[PDB]
Design a protein around this ligand. Sequence first.
Ligand SMILES: Nc1c(C(=O)N[C@@H](CC(=O)O)C(=O)O)ncn1[C@@H]1O[C@H](COP(=O)(O)O)[C@@H](O)[C@H]1O
Ligand SMILES: Nc1c(C(=O)N[C@@H](CC(=O)O)C(=O)O)ncn1[C@@H]1O[C@H](COP(=O)(O)O)[C@@H](O)[C@H]1O
Ligand SMILES: Nc1c(C(=O)O)ncn1[C@@H]1O[C@H](COP(=O)(O)O)[C@@H](O)[C@H]1O
Ligand SMILES: Nc1c(C(=O)O)ncn1[C@@H]1O[C@H](COP(=O)(O)O)[C@@H](O)[C@H]1O
Lengths: 419, 419
Amino acid sequence: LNIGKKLYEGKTKEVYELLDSPGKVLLQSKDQITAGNAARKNHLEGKAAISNKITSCIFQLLQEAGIKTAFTRKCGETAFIAPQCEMIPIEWVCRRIATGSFLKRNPGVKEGYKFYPPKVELFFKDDANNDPQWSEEQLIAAKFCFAGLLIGQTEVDIMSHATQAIFEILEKSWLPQNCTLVDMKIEFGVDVTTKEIVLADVIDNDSWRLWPSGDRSQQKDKQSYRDLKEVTPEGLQMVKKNFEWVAERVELLLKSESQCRVVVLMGSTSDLGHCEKIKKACGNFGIPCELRVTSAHKGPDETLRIKAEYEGDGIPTVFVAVAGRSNGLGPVMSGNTAYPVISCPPLTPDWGVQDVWSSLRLPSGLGCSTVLSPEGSAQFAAQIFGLSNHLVWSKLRASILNTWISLKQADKKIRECNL
Amino acid sequence: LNIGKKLYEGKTKEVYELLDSPGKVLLQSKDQITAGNAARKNHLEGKAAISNKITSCIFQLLQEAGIKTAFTRKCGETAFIAPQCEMIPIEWVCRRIATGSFLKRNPGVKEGYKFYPPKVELFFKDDANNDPQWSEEQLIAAKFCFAGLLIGQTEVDIMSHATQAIFEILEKSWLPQNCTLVDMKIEFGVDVTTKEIVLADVIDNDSWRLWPSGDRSQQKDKQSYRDLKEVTPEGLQMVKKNFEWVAERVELLLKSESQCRVVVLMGSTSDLGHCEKIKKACGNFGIPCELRVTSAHKGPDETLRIKAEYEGDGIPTVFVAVAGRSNGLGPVMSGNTAYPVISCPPLTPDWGVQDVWSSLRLPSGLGCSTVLSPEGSAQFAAQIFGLSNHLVWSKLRASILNTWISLKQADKKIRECNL
Ligand SMILES: Nc1c(C(=O)N[C@@H](CC(=O)O)C(=O)O)ncn1[C@@H]1O[C@H](COP(=O)(O)O)[C@@H](O)[C@H]1O
Ligand SMILES: Nc1c(C(=O)N[C@@H](CC(=O)O)C(=O)O)ncn1[C@@H]1O[C@H](COP(=O)(O)O)[C@@H](O)[C@H]1O
Ligand SMILES: Nc1c(C(=O)O)ncn1[C@@H]1O[C@H](COP(=O)(O)O)[C@@H](O)[C@H]1O
Ligand SMILES: Nc1c(C(=O)O)ncn1[C@@H]1O[C@H](COP(=O)(O)O)[C@@H](O)[C@H]1O
């Protein structure tokens, strides 16, 4: 592990070059806590390890969801390796609940006002003037350029949208711990190699407000330190316990709270290719997916026996019925299970206009849905599992963001042919 | 004209009761100009008449577009009659071009930054503290109640949307005079009788920034007075000329700059009812609409002769072809005029699925469009005329607003069944 020159030095972390690794850096956390732009600063033993653990869990969580993030791997108790970025000097805040500086800048608004959707604000990084709020108009007018990327309307719109998606994913991920994510701050950078804007710096207990059971008086974040009238060593021990409480629970955000399974039932092996597309698409959402062959018309006894094997082992299941021509498979399955059934018929333009009505017009007492896209049927099945599984939900949420970013990037490209 | 007690008294106008007229008031303008919350104040002869003329033209313009507005009629040189309202103490600003206080509150943004869509801001009315900017969150938290209407999320969303629509309509209306509407301020009230939020107070030369040829140095609005280092009587005469310049041109916003006509051609008198719906709908947009009877199949010589009568008199024309069954009327018309042709076939569920393809799949060199809704065909024809006629455009723009407000009101009603 061949460390090079000190590239940047902050109040709680240092970034070093790696002579062994082109375009990667090491972020070393420090045993230091700070607040405000006066002399609130303190040595706190174990803080480097707590900070590094939290940002390492959180970045792994966001990266595995599909959020583009400056994170390679954890690297000992107190550092992590990241792709080298040029930092954008903006603090991006997202709020679910109005507290803190939102109340100061908006007198009359009360503690607890809820933002639907979550509110995004920008602060320019400058300690000298205590990080003043900026409009999007101010950020665009600054004509910032980092690793050769000019930060214009498109880039500002992307960091704004991503800030909201990242908040939403962290908010959903803390929920199973009975913790309310109130707000957070993040920073983005331009990856010097890819030129992509990515989540960067760190996310740790300085980055957010976390209320157990949504109770402010139980705050576990750095606000406990900000709020001390006087820093005593008894005060610093409470703040340390709060950091430890977060650190003891953060790894559980990477844990699945619910098992998920899709079972694709096909009436014929000639539909196998259509079924492989559903299975592959389920893999993108981290949902195990099984293929089976059964015909409602030639083997209805066996259809019900197979159904029962999946009903009976306790694993929450979505069935996808793939039957061409007169689809009896979705209907018979739909009528005989309390679990959801999705018909995804392998329609073609020859007879598809005729065949689809066998999936759509069903007798009463049948919940059976229809999704024509095979990738769509997996996505629908993911949306069902996302109601009870934060990891699936997070991949769906990040996927909304990434698709939207792709449109922005494609419109930016085509906009050039208009000059 | 039986005047009653003085109800409110401001710096430039007074509101009186009308003993003869329940729920109506008289707004009397004054020969007074003011700026800021120090001693910039001056008698200016003819200002009452200039102010009253401008707000009377502008309110007539907005009201005839379909913007809900506290305006009954002009009432002498220096007053106008209005429905009685309880004023909402918010200054609603809309901007196309960043200047003025937008530059002070956003250092770094340059004179001339364009807002797409136009930017809406709120300022709380309070002279003591110089009208501080409010967030929507602050306005909602104030829980203001006027004529019994609680001002919540829905009401704030309506005033915000209406502010933008009113700006857009004034902006479009000034364009034919080569004047750039840069920004404006308006106020809304709750009509004490209807309980509807309506545009109120006044719109005059104090209300906006108007740049001839988009040149700031040619400003014709009250900014000319705000900007004087020292008020001299030579300075006040320039400001008076600027007010007179606006007053001499404002009546021209009520003038049509282009003639518009729809001609509905029907193959049979059995389709007349369908044609009456198009004609009535054209009336809603102030577009004259003629009905004619001609068959492409039984009288194609006559179809072309009628076409030529409308092509030949100089009046810009949209043709609507109404032919049931195999529509030959739209095609033959489309092929023989440079003017737009819209097929609006009187489809019914009996044979409509079969009949529509005769309007849709045309030989090359035919521009002919299809609009199934008869009210839709008039609206499409209005959208075409709105490219060259600000009065039509303004009715279409106000109609977007009003329809959106109707949805907000219907969602507010149905939301009650969920409690
Ligand atoms: N990370 C930071 C910072 C921050 O960088 N603070 C330093 C001060 C400084 O470095 O200048 C400190 O006092 O901790 N301030 C707020 N937040 C977070 O951002 C969201 C907004 O908080 P608000 O704007 O309401 O203070 C909440 O989640 C804070 O934890
Ligand atoms: N009507 C007013 C007022 C206004 O009420 N002003 C008074 C002062 C006062 O009464 O407190 C005056 O100085 O004229 N200030 C701005 N505007 C208009 O609102 C938009 C925003 O202007 P900005 O906020 O940039 O000054 C532009 O069109 C101004 O003409
Ligand atoms: N096509 C089927 C099947 C089946 O295929 O099992 N069972 C009932 N149906 C038909 O659906 C309509 C609605 O019937 P219900 O909603 O009362 O079951 C009827 O015409 C029935 O014969
Ligand atoms: N249906 C009509 C008429 C007409 O009705 O006058 N004129 C040409 N067509 C047909 O449209 C197709 C496209 O032809 P063009 O686009 O080259 O006119 C052809 O098959 C033609 O016979």
